[PDB]
Structure formats: structure tokens, C-alpha cells
Amino acid sequence: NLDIIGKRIEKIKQEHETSWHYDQDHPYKTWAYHGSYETKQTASSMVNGVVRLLTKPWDIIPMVTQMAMTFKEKVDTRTQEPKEGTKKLMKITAEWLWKELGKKKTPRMCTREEFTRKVRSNAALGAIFNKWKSAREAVEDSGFWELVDKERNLHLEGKCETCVYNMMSRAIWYMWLGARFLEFEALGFLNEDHWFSRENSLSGVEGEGLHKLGYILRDVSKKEGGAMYADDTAGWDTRITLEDLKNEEMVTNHMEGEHKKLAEAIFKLTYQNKVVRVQRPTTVMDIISRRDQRGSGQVVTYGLNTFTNMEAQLIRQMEGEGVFKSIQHLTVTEEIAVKNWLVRVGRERLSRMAISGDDCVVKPLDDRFASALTALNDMGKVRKDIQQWEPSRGWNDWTQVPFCSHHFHELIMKDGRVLVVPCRNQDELIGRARISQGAGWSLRETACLGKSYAQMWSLMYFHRRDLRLAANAICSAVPSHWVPTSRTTHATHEWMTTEDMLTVWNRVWIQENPWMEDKTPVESWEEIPYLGKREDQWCGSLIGLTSRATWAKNIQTAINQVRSLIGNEEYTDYMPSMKRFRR
């Protein structure tokens, strides 16, 4: 308890010595409270005017327009200790899984140089404002690195002074840049060296991209076995047990020297003991602590969520196959049965899964998996939107399975070749492209973000009539040489380029596509198919509405409206790449 966290707590106490008070009316029940201090501060979603002016029919669709407007009764709940049989299953599986992931990889420290390069190309490293303005300036100043050094040597000594979380759909634990550095130095290798690539982890999809995820699900569907299960966990990050954090820490068993000590300190001092500052309007700042749940950098969180989800799903597969009888206790001969299953078939069983952090698809050996719920529930990985002991409902067709907010279509080109394409309800896609985050956007910066959405649509969602038309309109309305941008950048964004989008389409879908045997390039956008018109409507198309027909017919007028706002620049007309504007 206070031996490991007190020092961090002590230090915050003194910087607000004028304000410290143990509030008697504190709302915490599962979080250990410690004190409050005085602050007074808050980032709403702003509309992208370039995208909205070129998507007029959606101005009267509430599912789009409501997205731009506007549970902590789940962070403040508790998870029970798993039974002894469950703890044994997790420990054997985790031991086995780090060894498999480690066979073709070497753990190593990430460098100041690597960290500096990341900051100088705008990645989301979840850091706070204070002594320097931005991340770019702290990294170019030697004083920073001396603070990093002090903390670094405190960790080698097994103590922590400044590694404190600041809490703020999605929960992010902002730390100061220095604490983020030390996390990256010790555990960055998991992402930097692709430990959760499909080649390395067999279940993982790190670095894949939406042009690959549908082909991966179709390959899983080809295995003999039962339904495809895609059960979401209710509040995954809140269900990570202290036993989970201890099995994750076993990656340190594969390390040596300074690295092993620096990694052991991240896990012991920051992950398995947390210090958090939270804004309460009663506006004060509460200093709360707890031992369990996930609270790490976004990138480390993705890797360890993937690890622990692979572990949980192998165990659910073991339960379905009758490898063990009860979670109450594993007998000595069950332990050897479990180890032997892992050695014998473990890699085959990993290949039956697609796992992206808390998100999974599993094609088990048979449908016994559906009612194999004892280990899953006892590990705390309770399924969302279904009663605890009700058997899972599986999917009979890989094209129906949800994964990473998409489903996937099989789309046959006029020349017979097969595309497996990503898809989701079109209101969601249009609604997101109409939103920006943060202040100080110039018209040029707003235009270049619209262009990023348009090029993503061309590459990933070309098969949706409305999005190929709107993408061509936005690319016609934004100056041809202006570079697409994002302010927040495990997937490949091939659309972030000033290269011709037909050339990028050929590279992604034909040349580098390992599922496409015939490498014959496509010569025009007219060779690139759409979904069936009825399927396009099913997935949210406005094709057939009077509003949509008027928009398509008069698109030049909309393009010209945006060009007139941006001013006298060099523009290209991309509409004649479409049959209906080609005379």
C-alpha cells in the first residue's frame, strides 16, 4: 500500500499545501481516496465545414447530425478473486503464451532517439502540458532528460515519485511525457517489434489494416468447426484482475540486465499500484489509488489486452473441449493435460482466432464452446448484453460477423477476381468525417482533414455509391497538391499520401494483396465494383432518395461553393472518373 504509492502522494500534497483537505463527502467506494486540492477548468466536437458542405443530404438525417452534438459507475466497481483452478489455468497458459510469442522475437529497450522521432511526427502518446509548452520542446531540452534520469534511477531503486495518472466512450490515463518515456523504454518493444502481428502471435492482427481483416476472417471460416463467436466483454479495462496484471508481468522472465529491472518497475510501481488525479465539480482534484484494472498508455494497453484476451479465449476453448472438469481446482494430471493440449494443438487453436485488444472472433472445434462459461465468468470477462449463464449465439456466415466496428462483404469484380471489403453503417462513416477535435483549425487544415477522410473512403469504402461520389467531390474541392492531415494518427493508413488514389488502390488491393493471384493492374475506377444496390441501401445508402439524386446531379455546384471559399488555388476535377459524369 502506502510504502509504494505514498512518495507520489507526499509530493502532490506539498505543491497544494494551501489546499489539502480529506473531504468527508467523497464519492469513491472501490478507489482508495487520499485528499483533494483546488483547480478550475474543463474539448467538444467541432464540425468540419468542408465535409458538411459536400454532404448536404445528411444535414436532415438525425443519426448523422446528432453525432456532432454534446460509465464512471463502472470504473468504480470491483472484480472478485478467481478460484484456484482458474488461477492455475491462467498461469500455465500465460507462461506458455509468452514463450511462443518470444520464440522469434528478442525483448529490448526502446531509445530516447525512437521516442524523440515519435513526438516529431505527432503520435498520440497520452501526455499532459508544466514547464515546456508541447512534447516537441520538452524533447529538445536537456533539463527534461535530467528529470527522466532522476525517475529512471528511482525505478532501478524500486521506488516512484512522479508516475501519476490524470483521468479524462473511451477512458485515457494522461501522464507527464517523462512517465510515458519510461513506459515506452521498458515495454515499447511489444508494439515497435510487432509481437502481436499475425505472423508472430497467430491470433493477433497488429499492423494489418481494414483491407486485410475481412480476408483474415474468411481464412478462419475455412477451418472445420462450429459457429464463429464474437462475444464483446462489458467494460474490459475494468475487469483486468491483479492476477491478470501478474501473468502480464511474466514477460519480464524473458528480459535481462537494466531492461528487466526497468520493466519490473513499470509493472510493480505504475500498473499493479496506480495514483490518479480526477476532476470533480463539487471544481476540485481528488487523489485516488487502486491496484487492479487496466490503466497504462494506449499502445501498451492494446498489446496487453490482446495478450490477456488470447489467454482467456484459449482457456474457454479448453473448457469447451473438456481439457479440465472444474475451475474449483486442477488435479496434478489435469495440469499435465492442459500443458500437453498447449504443446500439441495450442498454435492450431490460436489460428482459430482474430484478436484486436478486447475484440475477438473465435471459430472453436465445435459448439460446446457456446455454453463453456465457468472459466470466462470466473476470470471476470463477463459478456455484454446477455445473461451470465445463457449460451453464446454464434454466426453461421463470416460476412455477418462483427469485428473492429465493421462487417465484411465478398465483392466479385467484372473480371472474376474476388475483393473482401470492409463496411459499416454509412451514417456512422459520414457522421465521423463531419467532426474535428481541438481549436485553432485554419480553413486549409480543415480542408486537409476532409481530404484524409475522402482518400480513406476511396481506398476502403469505394464499394459504397455515396462515399465514392462524396470522396471524388471532396478531392475535387480541395487543392490537388495540399497534403492530407490528422491530429491523432495497429493498422496501415495508406490513404495518407499525395500519390494518385488509383495507383494506391492497385498497390493495396492487387499488387501487395496475398489473396489475389492475378496481378493484372486495374486501368480505371470504372473496373472497380460497388455492392449490389439493395445491399448498399441495407448498409445505409441514400441511393433512390430525391435528396440524393439532386445532390449527385448538382455536385459541381457544391464543389464550386467550397472552391470559392478556399480561393484561387490549383484544383483537379475527379468527377469524370465516374461513368455518370464521363459524358
Residue ranges at the known binding site: 151, 155, 160, 163, 170, 232-233, 235-237, 305, 358-359, 384, 407, 409, 423, 539
Could you tell me which stretch among 100-108, 139-147, 295-303, 454-462 binds ligand A1BDN (CB under 6 A)?
295-303
Q: Which of 241, 356, 476, 513 binds ligand A1BDN (CB under 6 A)?
A: 356
Which cell numbers hold the place of 563?
Answer: 472552391
Question: Is 59 or 232 the residue whose CB approaches ligand A1BDN more closely?
Answer: 232
| Binding-site entries for Mg(2+) | 232-233, 358-359
Among residues 97, 163, 373, 433, the one that binds Zn ion under rule CB under 5 A: 163
Question: Residue 359: helix, strand or coil by DSSP?
Answer: strand
Q: Which does 163 bind (CB under 5 to 8 A by kind): ligand A1BDN, Zn ion, none?
A: Zn ion
Chosen from ligand A1BDN, Zn ion, none, partner binding at 378 (C-beta under 5 to 8 Å by type) = none
Q: 475 near 454, Cβ under 8 Å?
A: yes
Stretch that binds Zn ion, among 68-76, 112-120, 156-164, 212-220 (CB under 5 A): 156-164
Q: Is 233 in the site for ligand A1BDN (CB under 6 A)?
A: no
Nearby residues of 553 by Cβ (< 8 Å), 6 or more positions away:
none
Q: Between 139 and 163, name the residue whose CB sits nearer to Zn ion.
A: 163
Identity (one letter) of the amino acid at 320? Answer: G
> Which residue from 148, 160, 217, 262 is in contact with Zn ion, where contact means CB under 5 A?
160
Sign of CA dihedral 245, 180, 183, 201: positive
**Quick one: what does residue 356 bind among Zn ion, ligand A1BDN, none, with the CB cut-off 5 to 8 Å set by partner type?**
ligand A1BDN
Contact predicate 411/529, CB 8 Å: yes
**Binding of ligand A1BDN by 302 (CB under 6 A):** yes
3-state SS assignment for residue 156 = helix
Number of C-beta neighbours around residue 495 at 10 A:
22
Which of 397, 452, 180 has the alpha carbon at shortest distance from 301? Answer: 180
The one segment of 44-52, 182-190, 350-358, 518-526 that binds ligand A1BDN by CB under 6 A: 350-358
Q: What does the alpha-carbon distance between residue 385 and residue 389 come to, in Å, rounded to a whole number?
A: 12
Query: What distance in Å separates the CA atoms of residue 150 and residue 377, rounded to the nearest whole number?
Result: 43
Give the residue, chosen from 301, 436, 446, 513, that forms a contact with ligand A1BDN under the rule CB under 6 A: 301
Strand partners, 419: 411
The nearest distance, CB 282 to ligand A1BDN, in angstroms, is: 31
| Binder of ligand A1BDN out of 151, 185, 359, 494 (CB under 6 A) | 359
Q: Look up residue 47 and give its DSSP letter.
A: E
Contacted entry of ligand A1BDN, Zn ion, none for residue 305, CB cut-off 5 to 8 Å set by kind: ligand A1BDN
User: What is the C-alpha separation between 109 and 55, in angstroms, rounded?
Assistant: 47
Q: Which does 494 bind (CB under 5 to 8 A by kind): ligand A1BDN, Zn ion, none?
A: none
Residue 160 interaction partner, one of Zn ion, ligand A1BDN, none, beta carbon < 5-8 Å per kind: Zn ion
Q: What is the four-CA torsion angle of 202, 216, 485, 443, rounded to 10 degrees?
A: -140
Helix (H, G, I), strand (E, B), or coil: what is residue 287? strand
Positive or negative torsion for Cα 138, 487, 234, 219:
negative
Report, in Å, the least distance between residue 264 CB and Zn ion: 13
**539 near Zn ion, judged by CB under 5 A:** yes
Cβ atoms of 246 and 139 closer than 8 Å:
no
Residues interacting with ligand A1BDN, by CB under 6 A?
A: 298, 301-302, 305, 356-359, 404
